Structure 1
Amino acid sequence: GAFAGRRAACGAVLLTELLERAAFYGITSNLVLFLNGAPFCWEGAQASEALLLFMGLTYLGSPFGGWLADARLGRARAILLSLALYLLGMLAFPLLAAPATRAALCGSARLLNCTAPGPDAAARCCSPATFAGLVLVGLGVATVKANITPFGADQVKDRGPEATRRFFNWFYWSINLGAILSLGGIAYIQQNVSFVTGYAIPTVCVGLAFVVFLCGQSVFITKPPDGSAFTDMFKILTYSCEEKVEDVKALVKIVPVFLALIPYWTVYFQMQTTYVLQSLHLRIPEISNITTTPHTLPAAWLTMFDAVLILLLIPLKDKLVDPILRRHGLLPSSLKRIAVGMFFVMCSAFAAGILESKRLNLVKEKTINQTIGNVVYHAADLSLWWQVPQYLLIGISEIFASIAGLEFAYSAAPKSMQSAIMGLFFFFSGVGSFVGSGLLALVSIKAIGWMSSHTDFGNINGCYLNYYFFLLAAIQGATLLLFLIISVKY
């Protein structure tokens, strides 16, 4: 009875979570490729900062979305409206993807003053539609991410704690499985079959999630708003210019580590976007066995390799590291693990810098033409298997740094402020993505300039991206050294 009922409820919640994670990892994977493939093809780092700002907007709206949810509006209704806007955006995107609807919705180049000879005119034309789609999708997924975890949490919590542990083990497993399946199938479809259907499958996915969450609401267990103590912390902060001491301790303990982690999430999302771009400009193998115009090995498949290594490591990582690191001459602490993760990501960024330098030195001699997607990409004879080292380093650093940061944040904060520190974590991750996009904008602009070439759409093979990678690596190393120095005086 109760078993079956709560099981159906949490299974519906799990299906919605899997489908939303699937749609997210699907759209975010090949966004850079399609942003330069479609006739509104942007200019390289332009699409890179577009994806960076998308991720930053998601992670910035997450805390504000949770506040708005636990605010006047109802949590379940909040998730409903979030999924509605998410479906709106994931339906708007295939309209951009389909030629007829592309021409229809965006607008002809003769009306929006797009008569300038060059591909930049179509970009000026179709920029607002894509940006609106991106902002809608970002707000939707932000609210969904902020809301879905506490939702199933209270859905299961009523009975017992072991039920919550089992349900959230299932939650982690479903999230990772959805990530893997989405990456694989959706990226393969997008890159090797059709961008149209490649985006349309996320659409029907979001539709299924929305309808199952709507029909679940009838048999769900709703929860009235509690008060969203973010308003309390905001009131305290603006008036300063028993919750007082807890608030001040929580903030003073949380803000420094997350400030140090801001450049880390910067370089993480930069990993994502610019390594997708670099693999597009690196050498891609051929699956042309039964295929004409060979199916390309996806950078999203490389990200799947990363994530499946995360999956294989994390439990084994615990099981082997903990008992041995207990009796070790290299004893680990939360801050020391964050420092180790920062050093690993610095090494990965250095490796990426050397890889880009070698790629430039090689393309300076000769050039090949591998048609990834629907547009050609000039590349050099250097397989992308050299990105696997830096991807592995970034993955192990992900594990170390993020898990240590969350452990320290939770162990150094009261119980009630757990949602507040989670919101602040996602907020600082969004801040990191925004800082990354800003740094890219700064290195790209002609004011001082390191890689402009007046053409960044497909001619990045002459641009100096390795200088920007080394600048990011140097910033990360400076933050790591500062964290080391603060670790001494504390």
Structure 2
Amino acid sequence: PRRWRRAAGAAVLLVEMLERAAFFGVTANLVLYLNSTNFNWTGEQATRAALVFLGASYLLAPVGGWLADVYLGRYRAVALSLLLYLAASGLLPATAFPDGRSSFCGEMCAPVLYAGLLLLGLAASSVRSNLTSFGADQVMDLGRDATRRFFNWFYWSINLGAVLSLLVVAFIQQNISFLLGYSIPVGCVGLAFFIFLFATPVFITKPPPQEDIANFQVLVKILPVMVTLVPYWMVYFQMQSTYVLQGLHLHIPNIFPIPEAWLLLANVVVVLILVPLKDRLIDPLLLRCKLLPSALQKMALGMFFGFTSVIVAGVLEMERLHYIHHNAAPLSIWWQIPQYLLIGISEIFASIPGLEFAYSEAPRSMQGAIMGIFFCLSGVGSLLGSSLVALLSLPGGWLHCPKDFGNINNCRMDLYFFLLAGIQAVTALLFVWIAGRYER
């Protein structure tokens, strides 16, 4: 933050959002190619595979980020991750040209796609973690309140990138043609790379025994606060789709003139609108009223808000069943915005304070490793939630509600929501206990 800290922050947000846009675009492209050409298994997949692949990328995040911050530094880490992303996008014409497929699976299609997906996930996770490290370093050199404001703006920028990614890739790859849909990801990657390189003067670079052993004493005390986050992220990730399912069971209103995937972007626009209001209002009052939420009580309050959101969701579910018992209806579809706002509040109070706390136990030897493992927490939670949903769907029944739009089945939505509330409350109690042990 020498003189253009606003410019540096804007460049970081732009490159992050463009990287996310390219990530979603190339993932959708390769998934469509795999489902299309031969790929004997065909993946048996048409939608939602993007979520599980993002979870796998977060799963690969810890080791890749650790390698980046140990044997590559911090600037070379993002440079090489973006170069590997260029390699993936230059492999993309092989997906485009039929000669590429003929040369790939005409000999020893599947293995090359596996290698490309692995490299793509590694590069995306590494660049995300190291961009977070760069931004945190710059704004910690700027100021602590500035650090919190930048973290909120960074999460908001990630959400904005996800929204723009979804809309732009859908429009380009479904409206005009395919070659433009191939040049758009490489184009945004190239312009983000040029933005990054143009911002290298204002960016501050950093250089890459008993101290390593002492770091294990920090790891063994900071891990329990983060492993207990796995159940919370699990609950939140299945809620992310259960809210969409609940809205699908309701009668959508017709006001002011893909629908099933639109609620996923609604959950993102909710955060897109809360973070500005939060940044401009809550922080000044949270500083003048002296609540003293020193990066851990904020997280506990976020998970308490998540529990309250589950409470509101269960109340709405029981209200829906009560109307059916009265003797199909919107069932107060306009009463889902309060619970969506509550879950967005929980998300913003658990992610940004989570990053801030992960940088409280930062010490600069493996600062990116802790970010990689924190994102691995969310990845593990999403993957385990998806596995639980699959287990309760086909043989379970609890998650088989979408079939027959939840008319006659063993849906047990009330039971699922109540058990989810119990799990969230147990997670909150564990988090409070572990936080109490942490300060000791």
TM-score by length of 1: 0.64
Question: Mind listing any 5+ residue stretches in structure 2 that lack a counterpart?
Answer: 37-41, 102-109
Give the deviation of 1:179 after TM superposition: 3.4
Deviations 1:420-465 (A, max 9, x none): 322221122222222212322332242x543447xx5664454526
**Structure 1 partner of 2:236:** 268
CA distance in 2, matches of 1:25, 1:226: 32
User: CA offsets, 1:211-254, max 9 Å, x none?
Assistant: 22455677647999966xxxx9xxxxxxxxx3145313311221
- 1:478 alignment counterpart: 426
User: How many aligned residue pairs are there?
Assistant: 415
Aligned residue for 1:148? 131
Q: CA deviation at 1:71?
A: 5.4
Q: Retained in 1: the 8 A contact 2:22–2:165? A: no
Inter-CA distance 265–85: structure 2 relative to 1 (3 Å threshold): farther
Mean Cα deviation higher: 416-425 or 132-141: 132-141
Q: Which amino acid aligns with 2:232?
A: Y
2:159 corresponds to which of 157, 179, 204? 179
Q: Residues 27 and 199 of structure 1 are in contact (CA less than 8 Å); yes or no, is this contact kept in structure 2?
A: no
Q: Secondary structure in 2 aligned to 1:414?
A: coil
**How far 1:277 moved relative to its partner?**
3.8
SS state at 2:190 partner? helix
Query: Any residues of structure 2 matched to 1:6-17 within 5 Å, and which?
Result: 14-17=13-16
Tell me the secondary structure at the aligned position of residue 308 of structure 2: helix
**Secondary structure at 1:416's aligned position in 2?**
coil
* SS of aligned partner of 1:341: helix
What is the identity, as a one-letter code, of the residue corresponding to 2:419?
Answer: L
CA distance in 2, matches of 1:357, 1:134: 43
* TM-score, normalisation: structure 2: 0.70
Distance 1:175 1:23, change over 3 A: farther
The code of the aligned residue for 1:209 comes to C
Of residues 398, 403, 407, the one that matches 1:450 is 398
- Matching of residues 56-205 of structure 1 within 5 Å: 56-70=55-69, 74-84=76-86, 87=89, 138-150=121-133, 161-162=141-142, 173=153, 176-177=156-157, 179-180=159-160, 183=163, 186-187=166-167, 190=170, 195-196=174-175, 204-205=183-184
The aligned residue for residue 119 of structure 1 is: none
Structure-2 residue corresponding to 1:337: 298
Maintained 8 Å contact 1:10/1:167: no
Match of 1:419 in 2: 368
- 2:310 aligns with 349
Question: What is the match of residue 314 of structure 1?
Answer: 279
**Closer, same or farther in 2 for the Cα pair 1:342/1:181, shift >3 Å?**
closer
Alpha carbons of 1:198 and 1:420: their partners in 2 closer, same or farther (altered >3 Å)?
farther
Query: 2:189 — aligned with what?
Result: 210
CA drift at 1:316? 1.7
Q: Is the alpha carbon distance of 1:458 and 1:481 closer, same or farther for their aligned partners in structure 2, counting shifts above 3 Å?
A: same
RMSD over aligned CA atoms reads 5.3
- List per-residue Cα deviations over 1:29-61 (Å, max 9, x = no partner): x99xx9xxx9x9979xx955x454233223222
Whole-Å separation in 2 of the counterparts to 1:351 and 1:51 = 29
Could you list the runs of 5+ residues in structure 1 that have no partner in the other structure?
A: 96-100, 106-126, 233-241, 368-379
Q: Partner of 2:289: helix, strand, or coil?
A: helix
CA distance in 2 between counterparts of 1:131 and 1:365 reads 54
1:388-412, Cα deviation, whole Å (9 max, x unpaired): 1222111222233334444444334
Partner of residue 390, structure 2: 441
Mapped to 2, the partners of 1:207 and 1:318 lie a distance apart of 39
Kindly indicate whether the alpha-carbon contact (under 8 Å) linking 2:390 and 2:399 is maintained by their aligned counterparts in 1. Answer: no
- The alignment-based identity, stated in percent, is 41
Contact kept? 2:55, 2:380, Cα under 8 Å: yes
State how far apart, in whole Å, the 2-side matches of 1:62 and 1:269 are. 18
Question: Equivalents in 1 of 2:71, 2:136: separation in Å?
Answer: 20
Structure 1 counterpart of 2:336: 387
- Alpha carbons of structure 1 residues 16 and 342: separation in structure 2 relative to 1, 3 Å: closer
SS at match of 1:411: coil
CA distance in 1, matches of 2:281, 2:322: 40
Please give the alpha-carbon distance, in whole angstroms, between the structure 2 residues aligned to 1:383 and 1:128. Answer: 50
1:262 and 1:273 mapped to 2: Cα distance?
17
CA distance in 2, matches of 1:445, 1:287: 36
Deviation for aligned residue 1:150 = 4.1
Amino acid aligned to 2:125: A
On the 8 A contact 1:286/1:294 being kept in 2, the answer is no
SS in 2 for 1:78: helix
Question: Which one of the candidate residues 431, 438, 441 is aligned to 2:380?
Answer: 431
